[PDB]
């Protein structure tokens, strides 16, 4: 078996492998997340907008369970592995405990796995960042964000990917308690943040939503075109 | 290039030395031990205003009588924290009694140098943990404050500061510290020092505070409690 | 099954029956129960035919490899030690009573008895098998010290014959062997050559 | 042993180790395979050129089974491992299906083993190209498995030293409706286009494959074929 | 089952019955008990049929591999060694009583291997349910160095004894003559049992069977 | 007995240039019938069928595992498996569980893919193959099937004649058996067609 | 041991996996593999590289492999690596059918193999598989489908796609020639011939397989020499 | 970089890592062995590198078996591990075959175990040489020497270490074949004193061991009386 | 030729397709400074070898390059001493294992093959190096007569009429070539001793060389004594 240490410390106390894994996330597609009052929005920028491509097989916004869903940025092949592990953990938590997992519980589990790949032999770190969003049993909108290192934080509105610095900056001076007043202003907020970074904004912006006690819904080409015209 | 268990010309393991340099980049944590109890404080270092301050947890409860403040790589600390928690729960199950602060620290200090490539299985650490710990609890010997670092070396101290500004904080602890301080005085001095080595204006949501008195259990100061101590 | 080994000045004298039975049926009536381990080391076999054959094979493989590395003729006691080890280690499975006998330059003619349990005892003469029970009193009253090679051959043949006539699991022909510094002297005693003893009549 | 790969991808997308193993096959002794309707013929240059060497001691043309023969070009020691694996792979197939393994099935199983050495840790690729021939269901088969693990079906092919000039000459003499006897002459003729000195009965090894199974020709047989 | 073998003047003669029974009912009337190990070595099988078949298939496949490696004619001791070492390792769980016999460089060799792992090298052996009947014939008529035709006659008599006296034996008599220059596999060598001719014809006429559903599917 | 727990019976008969395979349809635990249309015969090719009698659970397990191996075999070397080769594959599969085997005795019936020569055989639980030139039976009423088969079977029977013979054989055999019956299905394999009919049998 | 290790599964300064990137360069020189999805079927068109007068035909296909009853695939890159993957695909489909007693859906099969390719670029210290695949098949959930995976484990569903030598010129010629929703098998085959002729054409230099549905049964078949020849002549009439 | 691993041959066909391990044996103190007419005598010039060490510390003479002695030179840590290995072989041998292991077989077994560390890069070659001596009533007196590569030969007189080339000459003069253990003790004691460097090295202690007919075939350290009686004759 | 990566450090192909490490193992065979010669007769096989013994302190009865593998097989090692003993130990185990499993003595050509198979694994695996020794086996075949086999460190083996290994290998094969181009027990022994003598020009003495033989009448392998070697040395 391969047992060589891949991630090790450097002279100035840096884990090069983890920093190189975070560099891959910056080259990935932009994915923003906004936490509203009774709604959670996840928007992703479809870099490749090929017309010969089946859009249903390249989606970035998945579902971990009935109340938890997530988006990612970076290596697509790594994300799938992580998402499948998180899905298996959700069913395991529904078996042992007789209740659904909380958004922080699965975020903690995904972060725990990521950290393990940064301190194990014969394996490199995951090159993705996740934006776990969902609702707890009480009906509270949660928005967490994990990264390659294995550190997770709960946010109000966050963007990850290439144009995350810009989106975040724009979100900082746009996300208020009046900007997320309803279930339409939150959607208009996610689309606004994505529109200032996504080339030819409009048909290159997939976005799903999640309301309290409700599965996950992915707005289509027409639904999202009405929100993009409303803004103007 | 070299292995992870390579000794240097002086006599120190490179890897361990490099992991000690990663502990001087994290937020500052301050521990003070008194006769009334131990008090732990640590800056949260909030990067953006959109992030939830409560999501950041640098002070954790190992047990009812033991608290823990960390610094450096927070993700590495979670692995150690869980070991400490299970260790104290095992002790209770086997001896029907609580574990001492010194015993817990020693048990968590045994994982420090447990890394290496060759002659090891899949579930083995490839590198050392890049994080320093500050254990503060209350046992049979009263309040106690131990400090553990990346090399697996743990000691006992009255007032220890870890993190990027530990060097500066240390000097202030040596000046404003005596062996007769009260728990309330320890807390005040902790916030003052923490307020000088910071960049952001220390508020009630910018820092974390916890004490462990002989009477009550590990308690984490609430926003109001922290706001009334800042006065 | 009846096996016997006696020692004299020069070397030893081995002998056995040739009957292999399964209940009341004789599967083989001309079986060779005397197996050569080395040039001057033989072994009589009793008990289970497959157990003793596997044990004798293993010892023969080990003793020959050991004799090549040492570049020396193996000692009889070493062959007994290898049989003893296997018979003790697998005493729950194996059902073998081996008599090891041979000659070596360091100790001359030696007979080692290795019974079912896996112990190992050196004797001046030994008897094993199911038919050995009938000849304990005869080998006790008939054996004397100072027997020659020819006297040991007659004494062994007489004892085996007495046991073959009383035991249902013994019979056939008698296979003798004489081991010395020279080599081995194998010989069979068929029907009329087998020593006879009159039956009490009225 | 090592757990990492010795054969990796280069900047241009090539596996140098596999490509360097093909250079070892190219410098090897010339081999010739010809499929001629009623059978297959394998011929190889076996010049020991030293006189003390016992010609009959070793063999280049080996039978894998009753109906399959083998020939090679490149490293002899590596060829012995593959021959032993092929024989084991054929016996395993016969223990499950109770019928001689088809030539095509054996060539895939042997090529799978050669591909394993170009991806496993601490090992180099085999430095031997194979030429397998067989006869199953009234049909002659001729395959060629190289160091990379790839295998192709051929009608007539050259191997080892001067194979580029062996193919051109082989293609200018090959005929669809060719009999085994006539195929054994063209196989020796293409082997004599780079044999330097004089081809003798124990200077080259020939193996034929027809409906009666695979068998290695003998010195007597080769002598008669060499005279004509 | 009645299998037997003898060592004649210049070879080995094997023989066996062809009946296969499952309990007290005849399952196979023409079964083959003489198995091929190699060109010069054959094996007769008794006891468990599934074990004897799989065991002889393995040893013969191992000897074929061994024969390819060395490039020489396989020996009977090799086969004897492989079988006894395998049967002893299964502690008699692989009920395979065989009568191994062949001819190599050291002449003709006859072996009898038992399920536990013991083997015997004799001039004539018998195995199976009717082995005692065949043995009785061998104990009263076997002569050392017999002619090929005499050995075939004695072996046939031995197999016949078990066929007409043991309930587990029946059908025909298969023989196998192995020498240094040939191997004659006579199947069958004798058909001493014949089924009586049907006295009547109960031929089922078309339309005698009532059908509920029927479907036809054409093929290519 | 474990083999008579579910009951059942399969049969195979050789004709001139065709083969027939029949089986009972009853599925039941001990003396209680559950369904009357349990599949016992499975198609292993266009003209290759296999019948399985014994433990119902093992019948499905062995039938599913055989398909798994057969599918891989046909993909590897693009060709339909030969009747005799399928018997070896099944024997191997059965002998793998030498000590704790499946409780089913398969019956194979079919024609060769290039010569269409009738082939029938039957193996035991541990995989002991037995090729015959007339008929093969398997099940709880094997003794009754032998009696019917031995006196009714005729050499060189045409498809029509062959069907009637195997129908009467199974029908009369399962009527003398308590745990076998509830209907009979027959498959007559020809060179260009496969006729499948269900018989009018007793339902008690 | 730590000096000979080439470190195939580690990140680089810019956050890219070199081994995977180098393996995709090997697929860019291989024979052209194209896939076109129609309304009544899906086809595969691979350019034969094994071209020689002395080369025998033996097999039923050189680049196209049948995975199971309703799925076929086309490999590109290291042919030896493709032999390991195709055998694993068949074992994955057979395992799914032994568990659910039903054919495995196209996307589930592609995902299982993409998880194996992803594992060789993360741990183990071994080189990745230098082979790109094209999957065509029909399932009861999404009907006809056309997938395409790569060395890194990435994969996507397409309407029409091409991989291998000159796959960039083919893709650009497919976008301006494909009709989303209004493509028939006959018209799809014509498009394939016009794409292979542009990125190159004889009938021995190409291999065409189609996958259609007939009486609730998937049918995969390779077009015959004559069958293809006619197609090639009909494209010459329009040129 | 041909000398970085033991699993690497150099351009001229040499294993440098094995030659570097023999260089460490040349820095050690000289140890000599002499086989007389009825035994073997061992003598090491133990160099005391500190006055705080107890007289007898870091002994370079061991007891691998009751009838076998072992004189070492080179890395003490490595030599001690080899002594344990030799003790196991001898112990295992007695359990298996039922008798004392012949010295030639013990030498063979240990030499082959030492040769196994000179083939791969996973480990390193031992950096210490050692002599094995024993006496048997039937076997006689035997003296073998195993070096870092794994080569082991039988000897009459042997020396390993710093001044092993100079101690060898002073051993050829003696006629050990017709000599006796009691007389050889002084001879060996004198040889060690002559070759001992007193201008470069510091102070040393004399370690003497012997096995033969006088000790009834049992290996043991030379008695104080005899040790001091030979120490005065060599001075 | 050329070099790339670590081709000269481990057993991996180079640009020209050569195994440099295996080539360096052949150069290590001449680091012992000795030379062995093997000649096949008509009823025997002869093995003679240089027996260099400098110091008189070193027991000469333990300095032998002739080893007994089995009762009928004997051999002579050339090259690294430690490697040679390791290989001899394996050969003895391989031969004893063969007899145990198959019930008959291992042929000389089969033992050589088995040993060559083990040597080929070192040329493929990069974690371990090849042995720097050479083996030559002689013995009487059941139906072939005297045999002489030789397997090198590359895993390659063969059968010979007369072969030589060591520092003086080229010249020894050039002299033996002529001898076979133009043999009784005495004639064979003298031929082998002559070849070694003329190639080194030293006029070997009774205790300067070692001789091992096998005959048809006496298959048992044995090593000629000094007196026996001197009897053949005073007849040339």
Swiss-Prot record, chain A:
The 26S proteasome consists of a 20S proteasome core and two 19S regulatory subunits. The 20S proteasome core is a barrel-shaped complex made of 28 subunits that are arranged in four stacked rings. The two outer rings are each formed by seven alpha subunits, and the two inner rings are formed by seven beta subunits. The proteolytic activity is exerted by three beta-subunits PSMB5, PSMB6 and PSMB7. PSMA7 interacts directly with the PSMG1-PSMG2 heterodimer which promotes 20S proteasome assembly. Interacts with HIF1A. Interacts with RAB7A. Interacts with PRKN. Interacts with ABL1 and ABL2. GO terms for cellular component: cytosol; nucleoplasm; proteasome core complex; proteasome core complex, alpha-subunit complex. GO terms for molecular function: identical protein binding. One of its GO terms (biological process) is ubiquitin-dependent protein catabolic process. Belongs to the peptidase T1A family. NCBIfam families: PRK03996.1. It holds the Pfam family Proteasome_A_N. Phosphorylation by ABL1 or ABL2 leads to an inhibition of proteasomal activity and cell cycle transition blocks. This is Proteasome subunit alpha type-7. The modification Phosphotyrosine is found at residue 152. InterPro entries: Ntn_hydrolases_N, Proteasome_alpha, Proteasome_alpha-type, Proteasome_asu_N, Proteasome_sua/b. It comes from Mus musculus (Mouse). It is found in: Cytoplasm; Nucleus.
UniProtKB/Swiss-Prot annotation, chain B:
It comes from Mus musculus. It is found in: Cytoplasm; Nucleus. InterPro entries: Ntn_hydrolases_N (IPR029055), Proteasome_alpha (IPR050115), Proteasome_alpha-type (IPR023332), Proteasome_alpha_type_5 (IPR033812), Proteasome_asu_N (IPR000426), Proteasome_sua/b (IPR001353). This is Proteasome subunit alpha type-5. It comes from the Eukaryota. The modification Phosphothreonine is found at residue 47. Pfam families: Proteasome, Proteasome_A_N. Belongs to the peptidase T1A family.
Curated annotation (Swiss-Prot), chain F:
The modification N-acetylserine is found at residue 1. Detected in liver (at protein level). It is found in: Cytoplasm; Nucleus. Its main location: cytoplasm. The modification N6-acetyllysine is found at residue 76. The keyword Cytoplasm applies. GO terms for cellular component: cytosol; nucleoplasm; proteasome core complex; proteasome core complex, beta-subunit complex. Keywords: Acetylation, Cytoplasm, Nucleus, Proteasome. It comes from the Eukaryota. GO terms for biological process: proteasome-mediated ubiquitin-dependent protein catabolic process; protein catabolic process. One of its GO terms (molecular function) is endopeptidase activity. Non-catalytic component of the 20S core proteasome complex involved in the proteolytic degradation of most intracellular proteins. This complex plays numerous essential roles within the cell by associating with different regulatory particles. Associated with two 19S regulatory particles, forms the 26S proteasome and thus participates in the ATP-dependent degradation of ubiquitinated proteins. PANTHER family: METALLOPROTEASE TLDD, PROTEASOME SUBUNIT BETA TYPE-3. This is Proteasome subunit beta type-3.
From Swiss-Prot, chain H:
InterPro entries: Ntn_hydrolases_N, Proteasome_alpha, Proteasome_alpha-type, Proteasome_asu_N, Proteasome_sua/b. This is Proteasome subunit alpha type-3. Keywords: Acetylation, Cytoplasm, Nucleus, Phosphoprotein, Proteasome. The modification N6-acetyllysine is found at residues 51, 200, 224. GO terms for molecular function: ubiquitin protein ligase binding. Belongs to the peptidase T1A family. One of its GO terms (cellular component) is proteasome core complex. SMART domains: Proteasome_A_N. Detected in liver (at protein level). It is found in: Cytoplasm; Nucleus. It comes from Mus musculus (Mouse).
């Amino acid at each position: 078996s391969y047992d060589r240490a891949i991630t090790v410390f450097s002279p100035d106390g840096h884990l090069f492998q983890v920093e190189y894994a975070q560099e891959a996330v910056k080259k990935g597609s932009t994915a923003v997340g906004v936490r509203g009052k009774d709604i959670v929005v996840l928007g992703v920028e479809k870099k490749s907008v090929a017309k010969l491509q089946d859009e249903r097989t390249v989606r970035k916004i998945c579902a971990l369970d009935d109340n938890v869903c997530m988006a990612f940025a970076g290596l697509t092949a790594d994300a799938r592995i992580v998402i499948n592990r998180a899905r298996v953990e959700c069913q395991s938590h529904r078996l042992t405990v007789e209740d659904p997992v909380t958004v922080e519980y699965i975020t903690r589990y995904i972060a725990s796995l990521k950290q393990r790949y940064t301190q194990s032999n014969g394996r490199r770190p995951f090159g993705i960042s996740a934006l776990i969003v969902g609702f707890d049993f009480d009906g509270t909108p949660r928005l967490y964000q994990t990264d390659p290192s294995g550190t997770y934080h709960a946010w109000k509105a966050n963007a990850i990917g290439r144009g995350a610095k810009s989106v975040r900056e724009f979100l900082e001076k746009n996300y208020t308690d009046d900007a997320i007043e309803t279930d339409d202003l939150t959607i208009k907020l996610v689309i606004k943040a994505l529109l200032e970074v996504v080339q030819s904004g409009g048909k290159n912006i997939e976005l799903a939503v999640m309301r309290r006690d409700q599965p996950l819904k992915i707005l289509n080409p027409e639904e999202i075109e009405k929100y993009v015209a409303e803004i103007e | 290039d070299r292995g992870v268990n390579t000794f240097s010309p002086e006599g120190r393991l490179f890897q361990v030395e490099y992991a000690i340099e990663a502990i001087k980049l994290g937020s500052t944590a301050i521990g003070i031990q008194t006769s009334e109890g131990v008090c732990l404080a640590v800056e949260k270092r909030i990067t953006s205003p959109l992030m939830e301050p409560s999501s950041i947890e640098k002070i954790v409860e190992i047990d009812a009588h033991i608290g823990c403040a960390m610094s450096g790589l927070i993700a590495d600390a979670k692995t150690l924290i869980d070991k400490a928690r299970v260790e104290t729960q095992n002790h209770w199950f086997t001896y029907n009694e609580t574990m001492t602060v010194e015993s817990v620290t020693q048990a968590v200090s045994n994982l420090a140098l447990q890394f290496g490539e060759e002659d090891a299985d899949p579930g083995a650490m490839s590198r050392p943990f890049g994080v320093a710990l500050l254990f503060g609890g209350v046992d049979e010997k009263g309040p106690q404050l131990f400090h553990m670092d990346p090399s697996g070396t743990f000691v006992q101290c009255d007032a220890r500061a870890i993190g990027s500004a530990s060097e500066g904080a240390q000097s202030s602890l040596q000046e404003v510290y005596h062996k007769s301080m009260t728990l309330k005085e320890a807390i005040k001095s902790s916030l003052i020092i923490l307020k000088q080595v910071m960049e952001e204006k220390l508020n009630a949501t910018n820092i974390e505070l916890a004490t462990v008195q002989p009477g009550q259990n590990f308690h984490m100061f609430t926003k109001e409690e922290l706001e009334e101590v800042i006065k | 099954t009846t096996i016997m080994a006696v020692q004299f000045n020069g070397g030893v004298v081995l002998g056995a029956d040739s009957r292999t039975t399964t209940g009341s049926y004789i599967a083989n009536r001309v079986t060779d129960k005397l197996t050569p381990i080395h040039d001057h080391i033989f072994c009589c076999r009793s008990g289970s035919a497959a157990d003793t054959q596997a044990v004798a094979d293993a010892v023969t493989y080990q003793l020959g490899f050991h004799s090549i590395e040492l570049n020396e003729p193996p000692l009889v006691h070493t062959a007994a030690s290898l049989f003893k080890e296997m018979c003790y280690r697998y005493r729950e499975d194996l059902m073998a009573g081996i008599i090891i006998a041979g000659w070596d330059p360091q100790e001359g003619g030696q007979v080692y008895s290795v019974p079912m349990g896996g112990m190992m005892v050196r004797q001046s003469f030994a008897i094993g098998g199911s038919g050995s029970s009938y000849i304990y009193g005869y080998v006790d009253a008939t054996y004397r010290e100072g027997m020659t090679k020819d006297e040991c051959l007659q004494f062994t043949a007489n004892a085996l014959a007495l046991a073959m006539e009383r035991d249902g699991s013994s019979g056939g022909v008698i296979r003798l062997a004489a081991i010395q510094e020279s080599g081995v002297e194998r010989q069979v005693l068929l029907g009329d050559q087998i020593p006879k003893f009159t039956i009490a009549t009225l | 042993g090592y757990s990492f790969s010795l054969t990796t991808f280069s900047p241009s997308g090539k596996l140098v180790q596999i490509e360097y193993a093909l250079a070892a096959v190219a410098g090897g002794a010339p081999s010739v395979g010809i499929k001629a309707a009623n059978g297959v013929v394998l011929a190889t240059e076996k010049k020991q050129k030293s006189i003390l060497y016992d010609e009959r001691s070793v063999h280049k043309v080996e039978p894998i089974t009753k109906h399959i023969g083998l020939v090679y070009s490149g490293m002899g020691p590596d060829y012995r491992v593959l021959v032993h694996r092929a024989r084991k792979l054929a016996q395993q197939y016969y223990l499950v299906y109770q019928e001689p393994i088809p030539t095509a099935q054996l060539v895939q199983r042997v090529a799978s083993v050669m591909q394993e050495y170009t991806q496993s840790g601490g090992v180099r690729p085999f430095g031997v190209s194979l030429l397998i021939c067989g006869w199953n269901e009234g049909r002659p088969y001729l395959f060629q498995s190289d160091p990379s693990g790839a295998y192709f079906a051929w009608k007539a092919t050259a191997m080892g030293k001067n194979y580029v000039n062996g193919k051109t000459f082989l293609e200018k003499r090959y005929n669809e409706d060719l009999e085994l006897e006539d195929a054994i002459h063209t196989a020796i003729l293409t082997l004599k286009e780079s044999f330097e000195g004089q081809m003798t009965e124990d200077n080259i090894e020939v193996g034929i494959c027809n409906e009666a199974g695979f068998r290695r020709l003998t010195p007597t047989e080769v002598r008669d074929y060499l005279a004509a | 089952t009645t299998i037997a073998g003898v060592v004649y003047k210049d070879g080995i003669v094997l023989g066996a019955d062809t009946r296969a029974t499952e309990g007290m009912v005849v399952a196979d009337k023409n079964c083959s008990k003489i198995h091929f190990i190699s060109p010069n070595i054959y094996c007769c099988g008794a006891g468990t049929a599934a074990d004897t078949d799989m065991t002889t298939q393995l040893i013969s496949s191992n000897l074929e591999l061994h024969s390819l490696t060395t490039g020489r004619l396989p020996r009977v001791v090799t086969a004897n060694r492989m079988l006894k070492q395998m049967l002893f390792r299964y502690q008699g769980y692989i009920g395979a009583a065989l009568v191994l016999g062949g001819v190599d460089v050291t002449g003709p060799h006859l072996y009898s291997i038992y399920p536990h792992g013991s083997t015997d090298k004799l001039p004539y052996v018998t195995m199976g349910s009717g082995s005692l009947a065949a043995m009785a014939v061998f104990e009263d008529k076997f002569r050392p160095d017999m002619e090929e035709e005499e050995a075939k006659k004695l072996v046939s008599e031995a197999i016949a004894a078990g066929i007409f006296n043991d309930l587990g034996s029946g059908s025909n008599i298969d023989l196998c003559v192995i020498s240094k220059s040939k191997l004659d596999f006579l199947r069958p060598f004798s058909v001493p049992n014949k089924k009586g001719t049907r006295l009547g014809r109960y031929r089922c006429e078309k339309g005698t069977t009532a059908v509920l559903t029927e479907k036809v599917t054409p093929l290519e | 007995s474990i083999m008579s727990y579910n009951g059942g019976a399969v049969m195979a008969m050789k004709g001139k240039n065709c083969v027939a395979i029949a089986a009972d349809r009853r599925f039941g635990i001990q003396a209680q019938m559950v369904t009357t249309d349990f599949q016992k015969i499975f198609p292993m090719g266009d003209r290759l069928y296999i019948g399985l009698a014994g433990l119902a659970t093992d019948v499905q397990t062995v039938a599913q595992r055989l398909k798994f191996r057969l599918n891989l075999y046909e993909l590897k070397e693009g060709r339909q498996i030969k009747p005799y080769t399928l018997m070896s594959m099944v024997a191997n599969l059965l002998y793998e569980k030498r000590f704790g085997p499946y409780y089913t005795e398969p019956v194979i019936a079919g024609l060769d893919p290039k010569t269409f020569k009738p082939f029938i055989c039957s193996l035991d639980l541990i995989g002991c193959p037995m090729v015959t030139d007339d008929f093969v039976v398997s099940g709880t009423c094997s003794e009754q099937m032998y009696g019917m088969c031995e006196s009714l079977w005729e050499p060189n029977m045409d498809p029509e004649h062959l069907f009637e013979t195997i129908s009467q054989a199974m029908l009369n055999a399962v009527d003398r058996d308590a745990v076998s019956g509830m209907g009979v299905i027959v498959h007559v394999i020809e060179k260009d067609k496969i006729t499948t009919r269900t018989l009018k049998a007793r339902m008690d | 041991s730590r000096r000979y290790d080439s470190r195939t599964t580690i990140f680089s300064p810019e956050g890219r996996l070199y081994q995977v990137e180098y393996a995709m360069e090997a697929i860019g020189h291989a024979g052209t593999c194209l896939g076109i999805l129609a309304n009544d079927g899906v086809l595969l068109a691979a350019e034969r590289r094994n071209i020689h007068k002395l080369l025998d035909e033996v097999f039923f296909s050189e680049k196209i492999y049948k995975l199971n009853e309703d799925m076929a695939c086309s490999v590109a890159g290291i042919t030896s690596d493709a032999n390991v993957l195709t055998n694993e695909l068949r074992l994955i489909a057979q395992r799914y059918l032994l568990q659910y007693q039903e054919p495995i859906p196209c996307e589930q099969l592609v995902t299982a193999l993409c998880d194996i390719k992803q594992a060789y670029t993360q741990f183990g210290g071994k080189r990745p598989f230098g082979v790109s695949l094209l999957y065509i098949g029909w399932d009861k959930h999404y009907g006809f489908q056309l997938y395409q995976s790569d060395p890194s484990g990435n994969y996507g569903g397409w309407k029409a796609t091409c991989i291998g030598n000159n796959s960039a010129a083919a893709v650009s010629m497919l976008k301006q020639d494909y009709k989303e929703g209004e493509m028939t098998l006959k018209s799809a085959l014509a498009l394939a011939v016009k794409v292979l002729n542009k990125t190159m054409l004889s009938a021995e230099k190409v291999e065409i397989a189609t996958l259609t549905r007939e009486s609730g049964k998937t049918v995969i078949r390779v077009l015959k020499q004559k069958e293809v020849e006619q197609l090639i002549k009909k494209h010459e009439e329009e040129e | 970089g041909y000398d970085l691993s033991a699993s690497t041959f150099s351009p001229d066909g040499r294993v440098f890592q094995v030659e570097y391990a023999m260089k460490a044996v040349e820095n050690s103190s000289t140890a000599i062995g002499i086989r007389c007419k009825d035994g073997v005598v061992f003598g090491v010039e133990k160099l005391v590198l500190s006055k705080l060490y107890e007289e007898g510390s870091n002994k370079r003479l061991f007891n691998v078996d009751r009838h076998v002695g072992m004189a070492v030179a080179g890395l003490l840590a490595d030599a001690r591990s080899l002594a344990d290995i030799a003790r196991e072989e001898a112990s295992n041998f007695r359990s298996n075959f039922g008798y004392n292991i012949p010295l030639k077989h013990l030498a063979d077994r240990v030499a082959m175990y030492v040769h196994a560390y000179t083939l791969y890069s996973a480990v390193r070659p031992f950096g210490c040489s050692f002599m094995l001596g024993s006496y048997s009533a039937n076997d006689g007196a035997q003296l073998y020497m195993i070096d870092p590569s794994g080569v082991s030969y039988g000897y009459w007189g042997c020396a390993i270490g710093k001044a092993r080339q100079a101690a060898k000459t002073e051993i050829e003069k003696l006629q050990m074949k017709e000599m006796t253990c009691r007389d050889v003790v002084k001879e060996v004691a004198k040889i060690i004193y002559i070759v001992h460097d007193e201008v470069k090295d510091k102070a040393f202690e004399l370690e003497l061991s012997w096995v033969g007919e006088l000790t009834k075939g049992r290996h043991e350290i030379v008695p104080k009386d005899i040790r001091e009686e030979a120490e005065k004759y060599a001075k | 030729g050329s070099s790339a990566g670590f081709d000269r450090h481990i057993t991996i192909f180079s640009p020209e397709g050569r195994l440099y490490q295996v080539e360096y193992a052949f150069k290590a065979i001449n680091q012992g400074g000795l030379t062995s010669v093997a000649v096949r007769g008509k009823d025997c096989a002869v093995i003679v070898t240089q027996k260099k013994v400098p110091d008189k302190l070193l027991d000469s009865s333990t300095v032998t390059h002739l080893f007994k593998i089995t009762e009928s097989i004997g051999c002579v090692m050339t090259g690294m001493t430690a490697d040679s003993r390791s290989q001899v130990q394996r050969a003895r185990y391989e031969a004893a294992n063969w007899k145990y499993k198959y019930g008959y003595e291992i042929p000389v050509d089969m033992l050589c093959k088995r040993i060559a198979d083990i040597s080929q694994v070192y040329t493929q695996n990069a974690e371990m190096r090849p042995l720097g020794c050479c083996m030559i086996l002689i013995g009487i075949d059941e139906e072939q007569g005297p045999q002489v086999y030789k397997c090198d460190p590359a895993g390659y083996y063969c059968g010979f009429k007369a072969t030589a290994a060591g520092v003086k290998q080229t010249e020894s094969t050039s002299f033996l070539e002529k001898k076979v181009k133009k043999w009784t027990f005495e004639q064979t022994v003298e031929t082998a001793i002559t070849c070694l003598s003329t190639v080194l020009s030293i006029d070997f003495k009774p205790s300067e060389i070692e001789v091992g033989v096998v005959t048809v009448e006496n298959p048992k392998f044995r090593i000629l004594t000094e007196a026996e070697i001197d009897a053949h040395l005073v007849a040339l």
